[PDB]
Amino acid sequence: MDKKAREYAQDALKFIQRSGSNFLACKNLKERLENNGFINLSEGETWNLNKNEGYVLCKENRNICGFFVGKNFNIDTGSILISIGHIDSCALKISPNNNVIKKKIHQINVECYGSGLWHTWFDRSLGLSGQVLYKKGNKLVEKLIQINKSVLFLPSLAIHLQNRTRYDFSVKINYENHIKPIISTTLFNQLNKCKINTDNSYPLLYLLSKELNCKEEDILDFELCLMDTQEPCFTGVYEEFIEGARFDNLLGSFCVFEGFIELVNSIKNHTNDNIHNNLYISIGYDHEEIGSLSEVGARSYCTKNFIDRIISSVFKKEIHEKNLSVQEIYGNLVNRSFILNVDMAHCSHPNYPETVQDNHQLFFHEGIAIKYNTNKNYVTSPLHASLIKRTFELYYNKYKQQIKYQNFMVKNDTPCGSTVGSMVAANLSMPGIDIGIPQLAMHSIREIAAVHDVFFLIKGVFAFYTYYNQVLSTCVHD
């Protein structure tokens, strides 16, 4: 696994450093799915879905959703298997009116998107990734940009100005005042000008026009996210960790789609009856960090309408002549359905032993977290994790490679952030689980994670895809 765990983390470290925002997360995953032969269908034309074919759609370039229709569906004995991991992170997005000129320094005022460690974003060689809408002729042209060179810097305050050396000197980052990255000075802005809107920064507008090869006056408005220009890398002495940026479920949703790609490649190659019996959906949501209340979030009707469009297009012919309905067929498959929500989990911090549960601890290379909660912030029920642990045991009987797992639970007094596990499980009425891999410094600009956990997560989504209905057929209720 040492070789396959490093090869899995290598491709994840090719995915991140190209996935600088939520837009290039949808773009690079759609490019990753189209390399295996997925038919890229748009939401706006018409859906004529076929058996045995895989499909992919970016809903308005924020929400990736790739699904694979099995060969023999059975309305009677079949399932809809969904793996979920949001494609976004806590980033400093750029405000619309950004022209801050203070102390002879051109600045951007950025909006803090999500709930992040914003003091870690201080003193970073920052870049740009996101979506820019610009004019070309009479047509609005949309381009996803990726500026991997350092063009922004959020400077900290020098230590000499406040009181020093005690209780970490009472550091307080005011989110409006102190979080405003510098981009240029007014000296070299005017020096690089002689060789229309006053709301956009001309150092910024010169930068995007250099990337898009147009005038700065053609740049209309943009949704840009600040990213750290430092490439992700294997760390530790033994090159045993991974870290670069955005590992809050951009590493995790890589394993959602890498586990989904290996499933479809296992279906298409070497062609055993129940693998062609399911609808395997793999959706990368947006706007998780702010609560999923969006048109492309988890609380959206997007996924629920996607399944009701797959059911209507696949079973187009059997609605008419045996008088079934969509909600009859959808509620028929919901009993055999499942949701595998993948989002990162808190590894046991060695420097903070007071924020960890005693029994439910997570360590690196120890396996997938299975995140439980008091208040169902994670949707894991002890029945529905027992089915997934038996999919990990059916993986061990066939591939002779153990998928390790470990139960994670936050302390009863401390609160924890909710995920999209129970959001989609309420929208789709499907049972669910919340798994993920342990990482340290979650919601920060650099997040460290283990490379064996990337192997266990990719095989963990693949084992849930392959062996869920083999476990579900053996469950007898009263």
**Where in 231-250 is the site for Zn ion (CB under 5 A)?**
248-249
| Binding-site member from 45, 194, 273, 397 for a second copy (CB under 8 A) | 45
Query: Residue 83 interacts with a second copy (CB under 8 A)?
Result: no
Q: How far is the CB of 137 from Zn ion (least distance, A)?
A: 40
Q: Taking the chain, what is the end-to-end CA distance rounded to the nearest angstrom? A: 41
CA distance 198 to 316: 54
Q: How far is the CB of 74 from a second copy (least distance, A)?
A: 11
| Binding-site member from 327, 396, 399, 401 for a second copy (CB under 8 A) | 327
Question: Residue 455 — φ and ψ, nearest 5°?
Answer: -70, -40
365 annotated to bind ligand: no
288 annotated to bind ligand: yes
CA distance 225 to 222: 10
Interface size with a second copy, residues (CB under 8 A) = 208
| Binding-site member from 27, 86, 246, 276 for a second copy (CB under 8 A) | 27
- Contacts with Zn ion in 333-352 (CB under 5 A)? 343
Nearer to a second copy, 59 or 267 (CB): 59
| Binding-site member from 53, 381, 394, 402 for a second copy (CB under 8 A) | 381
- Which helix H or strand E contains 424, and what residues bound it? helix 421-428
Render 139-188 in DSSP notation, one character per residue.
Answer: EEEEEEEEEEEEEEE-----TTSS--SSGGGG----TTTT---EEEEHHH
CA distance 105 to 34: 45
Which one of a second copy, Zn ion, none interacts with residue 253, CB within 5 to 8 A by kind? none
Q: How far is the CB of 292 from a second copy (least distance, A)?
A: 8
289 annotated to bind ligand: yes
| Binding-site member from 301, 396, 399, 401 for a second copy (CB under 8 A) | 301
Nearer to Zn ion, 129 or 249 (CB): 249
343 annotated to bind ligand: yes
CA torsion sign for 436, 439, 444, 448 is negative
| Binding-site member from 69, 250, 264, 409 for a second copy (CB under 8 A) | 409
- Contacts with a second copy in 431-460 (CB under 8 A)? 431-432, 439-448, 450, 452
Neighbours of 359 (CB within 10 A): 7
On whether the CB atoms of residues 77 and 71 are closer than 8 A, the answer is no
478 annotated to bind ligand: no
> Dihedral through CA 403, CA 368, CA 57, CA 296, nearest 10?
160
Q: How far is the CB of 261 from a second copy (least distance, A)?
A: 22
Q: Which amino acid is at 435?
A: I
